[PDB]
Amino acid sequence: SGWTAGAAAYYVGYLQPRTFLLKYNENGTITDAVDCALDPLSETKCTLK
Amino acid sequence: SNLLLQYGSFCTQLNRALTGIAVEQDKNTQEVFAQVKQIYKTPPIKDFG
Numbered sequence: 001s002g003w004t005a006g007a008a009a010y011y012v013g014y015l016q017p018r019t020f021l022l023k024y025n026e027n028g029t030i031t032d033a034v035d036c037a038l039d040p041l042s043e044t045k046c047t048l049k
Numbered sequence: 050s051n052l053l054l055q056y057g058s059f060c061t062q063l064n065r066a067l068t069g070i071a072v073e074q075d076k077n078t079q080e081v082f083a084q085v086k087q088i089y090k091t092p093p094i095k096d097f098g
């Protein structure tokens with residue numbers, strides 16, 4: 001009982017097998033991505049690349 | 050599907066060709082039938098000699 005907790009937080013999510021469209025910029029960094037088959041608009045973005 | 054993922058370019062060009070065909074069909078109907086911009090009506094009287 002003789003203790004106290006410092007202020008911190010953590011968040012847990014779970015991975016699933018997904019298709020992603022990653023955008024590598026001119027410096028080789030992934031700056032943005034599209035989660036494919038999230039919503040139909042994302043599917044359109046996938047097909048159009 | 051995961052194995053097919055690497056043929057996305059082939060399938061995209063397939064669907065591009067088919068979409069072009071569909072737009073072409075709509076355009077064909079538009080050019081054949083929508084030449085006149087105004088919807089004329091027949092007169093109530095049919096005194097056409």
Ligand SMILES: *[C@@H]1O[C@H](CO)[C@@H](O)[C@H](O)[C@H]1NC(C)=O
Binds near residue numbers: 027
């Ligand atoms: C890429 O690296 C160069 C450093 O030479 C920097 O000037 C540039 O801002 C970087 N590009 C981006 C999109 O951050």
